[PDB]
Design a protein around this ligand. Structure first.
Ligand code: NA
Length: 130
């Protein structure tokens, strides 16, 4: 599923993402926009280290979900990576919350630093009613 901007914003708020571990809703929107273009079925294989990024938040298989083919991987979210490709983003959101509970927080995603950090991210939620 490819979410429309405001549809996703309202969904994330309902799932309790606004201010989770100090992260504003607009930052989560900026992250999903740059990681997958708000696409839940996005999959990106990283030839360099044999890991794969899954879903709307492009969660990595080495630490967060299990896909069985990633060497020395752990499954911190206790989820099959398949769960992160569903149209319903409840599991992806629960796993994203787990990722940010680690010391790095939202910085765990390099795209966030490149495209969202220290920027005016209000644009991602303007007019959505959140
Ligand atoms: Na894994």
């Amino acid at each position: 599923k490819v979410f429309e901007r405001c549809e996703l914003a309202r969904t994330l708020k309902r799932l309790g993402m606004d201010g989770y571990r100090g992260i504003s809703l607009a930052n989560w929107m900026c992250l999903a926009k740059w990681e997958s273009g708000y696409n839940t079925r996005a999959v990106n294989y990283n030839a360099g280290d044999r890991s794969t990024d899954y879903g709307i938040f492009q969660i990595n298989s080495r630490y967060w979900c299990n896909d069985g083919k990633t060497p020395g991987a752990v499954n911190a979210c206790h989820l099959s990576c398949s769960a992160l490709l569903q149209d319903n983003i409840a599991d992806a959101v629960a796993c994203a919350k787990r990722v940010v509970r680690d010391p790095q927080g939202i910085r765990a995603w390099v795209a966030w630093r490149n495209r969202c950090q220290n920027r005016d991210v209000r644009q991602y939620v303007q007019g959505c009613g959140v």
